[PDB]
Design a protein around this nucleic acid. Structure first.
Lengths: 68, 200, 50, 321, 1109, 185
RNA sequence: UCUCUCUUUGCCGGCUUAGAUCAA
RNA sequence: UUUUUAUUAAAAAAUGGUAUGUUUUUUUU
């Protein structure tokens, strides 16, 4: 991460660990290899929260751009 | 050509003089003048162009086809430096100038550079035998003594306080230092070295 | 009021500029060991010289 | 004081301990009205060593005018003249070789043609008089006459030390000649009489009127001098080509030529390294060939005055004949 | 994507932009500001006039700036919650700042970065951090009192007084008004101040003031002496001292800038004190450096002095030798100024002592930061060298004790030698055999018996019990890993305990208030029956002494192995294996690194001079040590390669074909860079399995820098005499000089030169220094080596030769055969000039020519203020001259890759881009030169035909009006001058202008034409004979041909090498006419002439010294 | 050349420049004074000018504090000064005055300044001296520098903000000309 | 209740190596 | 005791050096 990390979430159905930070990018860490595999890009500013949907394969992030 | 407005310089000597302006603009031009562009616009050609003149030779029509001359192919810088680079002849100035003769030893061995002036002295009937000198020459010695250094008349001064390969350049703005001297040194053979030393 | 910059002119009187520092809060006192140190040094100097 | 160097044709202002006579005069200057005391900043032992009396200016000036005088009187051998103190022979020989290369003296050392005697009749130096006397062949004596009058009278421009320096520069800014100070001086002299001799105009343009009047008297007397030889003095060049005026000058300043070096200095024809004075207009123009009149030498740089540009082929054609 | 952007638009709105290491700070600022606004909006209750965010942000920024400058930032009216929140966020930002500083400094030290900006930024951050720590330390010193207690101070003063009275020391007096040597000390001080500056125009205000004051002192000295004495007697408060750090990329050197007049006074006091102390024998011969030897001779003197101890290598009865190297950890920082003043009053006058003590209590200021120095010692003062040298003589008496110090130093009237004793009774009566303090490093040699060692170990273990045998885990902190094991120290339990015990005892000998010894800086090496090699590191050298007794092995007596003789038996007893410390290798690497990134590295000549100076400063200090170290060989290869790569990159092409070694290594006077070479050598290799455990023979060689072709670039080390040979020759020469001086004194003669011509420049103090013009002033310049070494804390420029002074030691290296040897290696002058544009200049012979360093136009603008682009161009001009000089080799045909593009309106073929060469070639042809030359050559050709207008083929002769674009087009060529015959002739195969045994009766031809085309040859292909032959066989044989006649004549002109030739069918009369006419043409054309002079002016290559001269 | 004696006008311009600029822009302040350098301006501000300096007569409590400190830390005036409350030069001069006064009172009833007597008097440090009183016509270059300083202190508005307002004025003039042309048509 | 005046009157560009430098 | 073999590279764009901003009407009644 380039800047402060502001949100983590360990998926209970995948061996993943999603993280977000004030550096505007959301990362998907593969916990089987401890390496970043996915990048989620659209965010105009820092990201302050990260949550994972309990059932679907979808995640929600909300940040300073007044948009979730 | 109006020599441009001359009031821009005023006083303000070298280290505050803005920059040279070719066309009242701050910009250099020419490869060896500091500009990042040379020629017309980084190119050999010119604004108008250039064409050879018509040729016809029939042992009477080539007579109108004359030869080629120096000026017809040069430009303003080239002519300027052609005028700058013309230095020759001289002759007469060198024969009657410099140091003709002086002191008895030089009269014997050194050729009298006066030359025609020796005949002129024949006109004056010099007949000096022993030459005659004037106290101005003692003042001419003052040309090789001092100009004083703001000291008093009786001031004896001190002896410890008086003091007096090539290639491309490192850059005129890049200065000098311990770095820029000749690593290969063989100068100062003996003039800086004594020939003997007192032992006692 | 900053000791470094102000984009506009806004001249500030010396009383305000002086009052804006923590110089007073930082105390200025000297330890008591300096006295004993200096007296011992002076005494030994005198004794050694004599 | 001033000392002239014949080997280099320069003059330098050097410091010299005063003579004994000067010390007595300085001591006695105080005490005119009441009793006074002098404090000479040295010891009597220092006084014991200085030379008693300062040498004469006949032994400390240019003797080229002197040789003309004796040759005009008819003295073949200069040694026959009763000098109070014998002048240095090498200086006399420098003057004689200068006069010979100038043409006023022949191979035998006698005055050459009407040129030599006519030069002898002139009050000015032989170098400056040559241009006037040869101007008759070209019918342009007038501008050379003005040049000579300006040169002998002195500096015709005034340089204030206050903020008026910019005002003086702008006042001269109308009369900056591309060809040097000499033609600048010619333009100033021509327009000076064209402004009704207005003293307020001279003040406004920072021009020394006194020098110009003295030049007027000099030129009038030189007009009488030329008329002594029945030379008309109504000759003017109707064309703008100052080239033949420059031919006459180059005939008058044959020795005083120099060309620019890469280092910013100039090589005199005699192989001397000189620097241009800051006063002259052509301070940084980098003129390829230059011609001067007077040289003043400082402890490090030899400075030239009366700067005027020239072209090489004039010099080549003049030297070849 | 391109077509979509063409038919759609930018679609720039709504796109994000990642943070890319340049926006990191400016985005971190946005996030912090937003967070502070959020907290502000929260902690303010309802209805409290929320319009206060901007002012609080201004307060936060001011707090951050105050923290950076170490200022309290205490604001009167600020409410408590706002103040607390601001403090919290400021602490967050400060921790981020410090973490980044730590990370970047570690990265810089490793060598991972080359940014100039990053290095400058990190230097600023570390300067601020260190100043904050130092200010806190001074505040704590005032708070917590003098750390040295009264008892310690009294004991130190008493022991120093007793030591001084034991030697009958006479205190230094105040310099009287009638002092004989005042002018000499003054002139020495003025010269050392002037050595800093030069004739350059980079002198700032302070430097200009210094130069003015120095000139005034030279012009009028006596009031300057009076002023100096007046300030010594009266002045006690001094101006502030600027402080800054000089980046070595592995540690930071603090540089103190002092006021000019105070610098003059300090320099005079320095000179006077050092001269007086040497006369009165204040320093007892173990303080180093000294004027006697350079550091390498000091290392040699310890090898010899260790070897000359009585029964030093014998270990039959369990005796042990411990050679403990150590550094007094933080000793400059702990110089109590009042105790220092009281101590200094013993040595000198009370006025001088007061001046020197009050000079150290100054105000140090870096930018907006500032603090008063009241505890430490400021090393930037001129006399700080003397001040440290006697405070460290005090520590010597603490470590040694008065009795052992008296035994070692000897009587005051008859002092001992460096490492020699009066007799064996005193030498063997104490375990301490040798002692030497090198500024702040201490080297002690211990010689224990069995009982002494066992008692010391028992005492050490009584207080420091070792139940788990942990004394072996961390003994050598990787220090001696350079040596192959079986040559390191063997970690035997008894030897390890002995080394640690010695360190423990010596450390306990020193009070903690004024110094300490760190185990991480100390390595005590033990020699005993278990381990045979004594190991130590002095200055930059790593030394290993192996006595002949313990050798039991045969090795080649390398150049880097010193033979230690024994003065009792006059035979070699031990060998010292010398190599460069890892610190020295890192230091050289960092020096090259800072050469590469600096302001002056723009010009090729400057970087070549930088490299030469650094290489000389290395190879002349570590003469044969740098050879025995296999790491320096590869480092030298790597760093020389990157020095060349800088030049390659500045020309925008790093192809190895374009840059043969002649470009870099040919001497400066031939147009090359004049680079010295030391990395063109084979690096020895041995099996790595048995390399870390034994010294195995060299079985293989790995190549160093590669020279394309067969070139043997000479080595720099082969022209430097190794240190051991120089020392042996020095001893011999000084002994013979002493005998010759004695035999000249016994009679009434005067010792003269030409009596010493054999040993003229021999001896470490060169014999030349005896017959020197300035040898009477130098008899008063004393303590100069310490002063030269300490000069690193005063000037921001690194001194390469800090260990020697040419005035006192003489020129210790004479590198002049390198020029002639490298000219021969590159192929001689003709072989070197084959690569250049020398022939294009048309100069007849090379002997007279010379280069002009400056163009005058450069000189004019060297002071005028210029824009950055104009300064860039002024710096680029010499690079352009250099590229034009080496055009034939840089613009060569045999390249690996590169698009073949022709220069417009020109026949020059350019491979690659190389903008510098292109702009130079444009300038050389700034008008339509190429085509003008072609026309002026055909014109001069027609005129000579108008002369011989009556011959064969004179029936028709016409030169066509060619197409304008024929001169510079080599796809094909249209016609030129035409010849048709009135009769029929017999001709044979076209031939060159060289054969007289030519048959011309093979074929029957009638007509011919003559044409000329211009070529700008390169180094690889410039033989114009083959060029014209192939060109004629191609253009004539081509099916389409605008040449009327079936056969004809072709002539070629090589503009780069001004050669010429021809290939065509011949008729008698025609061939002799061209043979006679071409030569007259090629010295007379306006076109060729103007080309030659415009090239000459571009090169600044002038003719011989003025033909008038 | 550079330096001098800090005429009263220079001191006053220094005070005004510190008012307008701050204590961390000494080069910018020294641009106002042609005859002085940034080091000199900073030295004068921190040694004489700033209001924190107590130029009043010496109270008895601070005098005994000075005596005690000068005994404790021989020399070392830069550290004695903060504890005493005065500047280092003030403390040194006061101590010297006390010693000289004690010697003078000693002479009535009966330290070796002879060492200080053998040479000339102590040359006063330029930055610590009181400013020279100004003459009625204090030459004329000072008027020039005063005029430049007055223009400097109130200029404000940045440097290149003078382009936008001028451009707005020119646009207003050109639109007024266009409208006037339309109405005269 | 108008008019005038005064007074009380809580009140409404950022970052970095101070970015880096500086003699008529 | 006889013999060996080992071969990095490599050029283009923008920074970077002829800034930029301005600029012509068909209805009144």
């Amino acid at each position: 991460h380039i800047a402060t990390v502001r949100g983590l979430a360990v998926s209970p159905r995948h061996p993943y660990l999603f993280s977000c930070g004030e550096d505007k990018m959301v990362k998907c860490w593969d916990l089987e290899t401890n390496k970043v595999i996915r990048h989620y890009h659209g965010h105009l500013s820092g990201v302050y929260a990260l949550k994972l949907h309990p059932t679907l394969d979808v995640l929600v992030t909300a940040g300073r751009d007044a948009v979730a | 050509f109006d020599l441009e407005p001359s009031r821009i310089n005023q006083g303000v000597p070298v280290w505050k003089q803005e920059a040279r302006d070719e066309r009242n603009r701050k910009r250099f031009h020419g490869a060896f003048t500091g500009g990042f562009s040379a020629g017309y616009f980084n190119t050999v050609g010119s604004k108008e162009g250039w064409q050879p003149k018509s040729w016809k030779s029939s042992r009477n029509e080539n007579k109108s086809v004359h030869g080629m001359t120096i000026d017809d192919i040069m430009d303003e810088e080239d002519r300027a430096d052609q005028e700058l680079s013309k230095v020759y002849t001289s002759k007469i100035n060198t024969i009657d100038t410099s140091i003709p003769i002086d002191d008895p030893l030089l009269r014997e061995f050194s050729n009298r550079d006066d030359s025609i002036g020796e005949k002129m002295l024949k006109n004056l009937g010099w007949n000096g035998h022993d030459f005659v000198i004037s106290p101005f020459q003692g003042y001419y010695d003052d040309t090789k003594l001092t100009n004083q250094a703001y000291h008093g008349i009786g001031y004896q001064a001190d002896d410890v306080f008086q003091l007096e390969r090539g290639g491309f350049g490192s850059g005129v703005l890049n200065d000098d230092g311990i770095e820029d001297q000749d690593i290969y040194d063989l100068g100062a053979p003996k003039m800086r070295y004594d020939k003997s030393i007192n032992i006692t | 009021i900053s000791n470094w910059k102000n984009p506009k002119g806004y001249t500030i009187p010396l009383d305000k500029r002086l009052a804006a520092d923590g110089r007073g809060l930082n105390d200025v006192e000297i330890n008591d060991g300096f006295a004993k140190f200096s007296e011992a040094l002076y005494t030994v100097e005198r004794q050694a010289r004599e | 004081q001033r000392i002239y160097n014949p080997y280099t044709r320069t003059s330098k202002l050097i410091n010299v301990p005063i003579s004994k006579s000067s010390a007595i005069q300085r001591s006695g200057r105080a005490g005119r009205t009441m009793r006074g005391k002098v404090f000479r900043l040295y010891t009597e032992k220092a006084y014991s060593l200085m030379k008693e009396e300062f040498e004469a200016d006949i032994l400390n000036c240019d003797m080229s005018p002197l040789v003309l005088f004796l040759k005009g009187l008819g003295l073949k051998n200069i040694l026959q003249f009763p000098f109070f103190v014998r002048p240095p022979t090498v200086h006399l020989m420098a003057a004689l070789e200068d006069l010979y290369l100038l043409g006023v003296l022949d191979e035998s050392g006698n005055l050459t043609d009407p040129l030599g005697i006519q030069i002898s009749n002139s009050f000015l130096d032989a170098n400056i008089s040559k241009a006037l006397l040869t101007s008759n062949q070209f019918g342009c004596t007038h501008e050379i006459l003005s040049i000579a009058s300006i040169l002998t009278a002195g500096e015709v421009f005034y340089n204030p030390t206050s903020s008026s320096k910019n005002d003086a520069f702008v006042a001269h800014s109308s009369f900056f000649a591309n060809e040097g100070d000499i033609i600048t001086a010619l333009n100033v002299f021509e327009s000076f009489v064209g402004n009704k001799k207005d003293l307020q105009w001279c003040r406004k343009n920072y021009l020394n009127y006194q020098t110009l009047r003295q030049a007027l008297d000099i030129r009038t007397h030189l007009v009488r001098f030329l008329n002594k030889f029945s030379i008309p003095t109504a000759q003017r060049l109707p064309s703008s080509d100052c080239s033949k005026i420059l031919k006459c000058l180059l005939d008058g300043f044959v020795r005083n030529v120099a060309h620019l070096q890469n280092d910013g200095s100039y090589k005199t024809i005699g192989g001397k390294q000189v620097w241009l004075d800051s006063s002259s207009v052509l301070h940084e123009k980098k003129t390829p060939w230059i011609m001067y009149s007077s040289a003043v030498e400082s402890e490090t740089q030899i400075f030239v005055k009366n700067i005027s540009k020239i072209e090489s082929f004039w010099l080549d054609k003049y030297y070849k004949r | 994507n391109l077509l979509a952007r063409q038919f759609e638009g930018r679609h720039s709105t709504g796109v994000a932009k990642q943070i890319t290491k340049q926006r990191v700070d400016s985005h971190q600022d946005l996030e912090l500001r937003a967070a502070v606004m959020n907290d502000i909006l929260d902690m303010i209750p309802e209805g409290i006039r929320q319009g206060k965010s901007k002012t609080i942000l201004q307060h936060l920024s001011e707090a951050w700036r105050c923290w950076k400058a170490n200022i309290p930032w205490k604001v009167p009216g600020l409410p408590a919650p706002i103040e607390n929140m601001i403090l919290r966020y400021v602490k967050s930002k400060a921790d981020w700042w410090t973490s980044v500083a730590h990370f970047n400094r570690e990265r810089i030290r490793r060598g991972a970065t080359v940014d100039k900006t990053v290095a400058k930024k990190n230097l600023g951050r570390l300067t601020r951090l260190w100043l904050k720590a130092e200010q806190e330390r001074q505040h704590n010193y005032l708070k917590d009192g003098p750390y040295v207690t009264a008892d310690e101070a009294v004991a130190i003063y008493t022991t120093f007084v007793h030591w001084l009275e034991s030697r009958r020391f006479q205190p230094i007096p105040f310099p009287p008004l009638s002092y004989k040597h005042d002018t000499k000390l003054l002139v020495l001080a003025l010269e050392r101040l002037k050595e800093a500056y030069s004739v350059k125009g980079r002198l700032n205000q302070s430097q200009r003031e210094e130069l003015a004051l120095v000139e005034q002192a030279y012009d009028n000295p006596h009031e300057m002496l009076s002023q100096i004495k007046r300030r010594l007697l009266t002045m006690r408060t001094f101006k502030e001292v600027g402080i800054e750090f000089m980046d070595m990329y592995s540690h930071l050197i603090p540089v103190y800038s002092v006021d000019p007049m105070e610098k003059i006074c300090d320099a005079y006091l320095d000179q006077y004190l050092w001269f007086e102390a040497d006369r009165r024998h204040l320093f007892p011969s173990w303080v180093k450096p000294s004027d006697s030897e350079p550091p390498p001779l000091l290392v040699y003197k310890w090898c010899q002095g260790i070897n000359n101890l009585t029964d030093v290598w014998e270990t039959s009865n369990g005796e042990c030798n411990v050679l403990m190297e150590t550094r007094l950890s933080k000793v400059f920082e702990k110089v109590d100024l009042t105790l220092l003043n009281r101590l200094m009053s013993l040595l000198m006058d009370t006025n001088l002592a007061s001046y020197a003590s009050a000079k150290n209590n100054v105000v140090l200021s870096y930018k907006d930061m500032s603090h008063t120095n009241s505890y430490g010692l400021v090393r930037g003062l001129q006399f700080s060298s003397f001040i440290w040298q006697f405070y460290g003589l005090v520590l010597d008496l603490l470590i040694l004790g008065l009795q052992r110090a008296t035994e070692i130093a000897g009587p005051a009237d008859a002092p001992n030698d460096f490492l020699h004793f009066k007799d064996q009774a005193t030498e063997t009566s104490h375990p301490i055999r040798l002692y030497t303090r090198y500024i702040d490093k201490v080297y002690i040699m211990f010689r224990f018996t069995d009982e002494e060692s066992r008692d010391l170990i028992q005492r050490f273990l009584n207080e420091n019990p070792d139940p788990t045998n942990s004394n072996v885990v961390n003994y050598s902190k990787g220090k001696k890993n350079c040596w192959p094991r079986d040559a390191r120290m063997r970690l035997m339990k008894h030897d390890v305990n002995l080394g640690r015990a010695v360190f423990w005892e010596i450390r306990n000998r020193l009070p903690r208030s004024l110094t300490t010894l760190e185990w991480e800086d100390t390595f005590p090496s033990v020699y005993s029956k278990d381990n045979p090699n004594l190991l130590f590191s002095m200055t930059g050298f790593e030394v290993r002494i192996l006595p002949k007794i313990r050798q039991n092995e045969e090795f080649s007596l390398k150049d880097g192995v010193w033979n230690l003789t024994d003065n009792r038996t006059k035979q070699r007893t031990a060998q010292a294996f010398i190599r460069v410390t890892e610190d020295g290798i890192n230091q050289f690497g960092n020096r090259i690194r800072q050469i590469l990134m600096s302001s002056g590295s723009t010009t090729f000549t400057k970087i070549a001079n930088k490299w030469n100076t650094a290489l000389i400063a290395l190879m002349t200090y570590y003469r044969e040590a740098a050879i025995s170290t296999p790491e320096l060989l590869d480092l030298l290869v790597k760093c020389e390669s990157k020095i060349q790569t800088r030049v390659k990159i500045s020309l925008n092409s790093k192809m190895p074909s374009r840059f043969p070694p002649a470009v870099f290594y040919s001497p400066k006077e031939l147009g090359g860079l004049g680079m010295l070479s030391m990395g063109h050598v084979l690096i020895p290799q041995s099996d790595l399995r048995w390399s870390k455990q034994t010294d195995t023979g060299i079985t293989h060689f790995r190549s160093g820098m590669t020279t394309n072709g067969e070139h043997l670039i000479p080595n720099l080390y082969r022209y430097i005499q190794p240190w051991e040979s120089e020392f042996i020759d020095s001893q011999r020469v000084w002994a013979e000089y002493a005998m010759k001086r004695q035999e000249a004194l016994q009679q009434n003669r005067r010792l003269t030169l030409e009596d010493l011509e054999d040993s003229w420049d021999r001896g470490i103090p060169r014999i030349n220094t005896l017959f020197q013009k300035d040898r009477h002033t130098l008899a008063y310049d004393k303590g100069w080596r310490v002063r030269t070494e300490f000069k690193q804390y005063q000037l921001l420029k690194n001194n390469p030769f800090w260990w020697t002074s040419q005035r006192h030691d003489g020129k210790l290296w004479q590198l002049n055969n390198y020029r002639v040897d490298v000219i021969q290696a590159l192929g001689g002058v003709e072989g070197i000039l084959e690569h250049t544009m020398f022939k294009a200049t048309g100069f007849p012979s090379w002997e007279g020519l010379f280069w002009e360093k400056a163009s005058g136009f450069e000189e004019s603008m060297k002071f005028k203020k210029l824009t950055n682009a104009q300064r860039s161009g002024l710096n680029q001009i010499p690079n352009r001259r250099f590229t034009l000089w080496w055009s034939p080799t840089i613009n060569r045909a045999n390249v690996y890759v590169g698009f073949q593009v022709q220069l417009d309106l020109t026949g020059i073929m350019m491979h690659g881009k190389i903008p510098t060469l292109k702009i130079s070639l444009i300038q050389i042809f700034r008008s339509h030169l190429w085509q003008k030359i072609h026309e002026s050559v055909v014109w001069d050709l027609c005129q000579v035909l108008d002369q011989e207008l009556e011959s064969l083929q004179i029936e028709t002769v016409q030169k066509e009006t060619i197409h304008p674009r024929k001169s510079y087009k080599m796809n094909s060529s249209c016609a030129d001058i035409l010849l048709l015959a009135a009769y029929k002739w017999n001709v044979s195969r076209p031939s060159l202008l060289n054969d007289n045994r030519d048959v011309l009766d093979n074929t029957t031809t009638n007509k011919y034409w003559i044409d000329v085309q211009l070529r700008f040859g390169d180094y690889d292909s410039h033989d114009i004979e083959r060029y014209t032959r192939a060109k004629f066989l191609d253009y004539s044989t081509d099916a389409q041909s605008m040449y009327p006649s079936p056969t004809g004549v072709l002539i070629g002109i090589d503009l780069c090498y001004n050669m010429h030739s021809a290939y065509g069918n011949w008729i008698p009369g025609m061939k002799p006419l061209i043979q006679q006419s071409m030569n007259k043409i090629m010295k007379a054309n306006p076109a060729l002439y103007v080309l030659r002079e415009r090239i000459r002016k571009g090169l600044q290559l002038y003719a011989s010294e003025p033909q008038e001269q | 050349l550079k330096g001098g004696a800090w005429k009263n006008t220079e001191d006053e311009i220094l005070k005004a420049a510190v008012s307008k600029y701050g204590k961390n822009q000494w080069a910018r302040i020294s641009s106002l004074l042609v005859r002085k350098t940034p080091k000199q301006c900073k030295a004068r501000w921190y040694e004489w000018i700033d209001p924190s300096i107590k130029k009043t007569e010496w109270s008895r409590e601070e005098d005994e504090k000075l005596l005690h400190l000068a005994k404790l830390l021989p020399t070392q005036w830069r550290t004695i000064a903060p504890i005493v409350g005065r500047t280092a030069t003030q403390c040194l001069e006061r101590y010297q005055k006390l010693l000289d006064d004690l010697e003078a009172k000693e002479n009535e009833q009966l330290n070796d300044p002879n060492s200080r007597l053998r040479f000339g008097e102590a040359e006063p440090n330029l930055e610590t001296l009181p400013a020279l009183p100004d003459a009625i016509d204090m030459d004329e270059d000072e008027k020039e520098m005063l005029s430049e300083a007055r223009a400097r202190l109130a200029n404000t508005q940045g440097k290149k903000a003078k382009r936008k307002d001028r451009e707005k004025q020119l646009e207003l003039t050109r639109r007024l000309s266009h409208l006037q042309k339309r109405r005269e048509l």
